Amino acid sequence: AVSFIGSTENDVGPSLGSYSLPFVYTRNKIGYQNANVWHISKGFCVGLDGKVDLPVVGSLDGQSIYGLTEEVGLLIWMGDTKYSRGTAMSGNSWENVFSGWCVGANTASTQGLSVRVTPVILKRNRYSVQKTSIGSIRMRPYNGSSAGSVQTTVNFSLNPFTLN
């Protein structure tokens, strides 16, 4: 079985956090993590797809730099719960960010996710960014499992932050 147990709207990073061309700035500080977004059981197989809606203004080592303002951009990761499992995002299409797993035929667990970003200074003049929509992540059932009657997609918004 599968049930949606998380939240539809999720904030990335602590609200109004401060961090000290182009040049990259934050580890896992600017992120959102939730190990329990869906409850799964009895053989349910699930992975995750991710999509970034921000405009791509460039790229660094194979991944897109998404634009926020003239001065600030972002490198973005989406994936399974643990931050080190994040998949570098490029473009604006749905991408496989977690290959997936199957819970035991006679057991239950949960499926989580994480979104992480790192600031990128595009233009220099402190830099402040306001709450901005980043994109979404949708569960990807496989092996015959069904999204059935469950919310498959959740959204992410970047909390306001300041770069010194």
Ligand X SMILES: CC(=O)N[C@@H]1[C@@H](O)[C@H](O)[C@@H](CO)O[C@H]1O
- Contact residues: ligand X, CB under 6 A: 35-36, 80-81, 101, 109-112
Q: Minimum distance from CB of 139 to ligand X (Å)?
A: 10
62 belongs to an annotated ligand binding site: no
Residue 35 annotated in ligand binding:
yes
Tell me if 128 is assigned to a ligand binding site: no
Tell the smallest beta-carbon distance from residue 53 to ligand X (Å).
23
- Classify residue 91 as left (phi > 0), alpha (psi -120 to 50) or beta: left
Nearer to ligand X, 92 or 109 (CB): 109
Nearer to ligand X, 37 or 122 (CB): 37
Task: Please list, in sequence order, all residues whose beta carbon lies within 8 angstroms of the beta carbon of residue 53, skipping any fewer than 6 positions away.
Answer: 92, 133, 134, 135, 136
Dihedral over Cα of 20, 23, 29, 32: its sign? positive
Helix (H, G, I), strand (E, B) or coil at 109: strand
Q: Which C-beta is closer to ligand X: that of 38 or that of 127?
A: 38
CA–CA distances in Å: residue 139 to residues 7, 82, 120, 153? 13, 16, 29, 7
The pair of three-digit structure tokens given for residue 69, joined into one six-digit string: 């303002």
Q: Is 81 annotated as a binding residue?
A: yes
Indicate the residue among 6 and 160 with the shorter CB distance to ligand X.
Answer: 6
Q: Cβ closer to ligand X: 41 or 155?
A: 41
111 is in an annotated binding site: yes
26 annotated binding-site participant: no
**Known binding site for a carbohydrate: residues?**
35-36, 80-81, 109-112
Binding residue numbers: 35-36, 80-81, 109-112
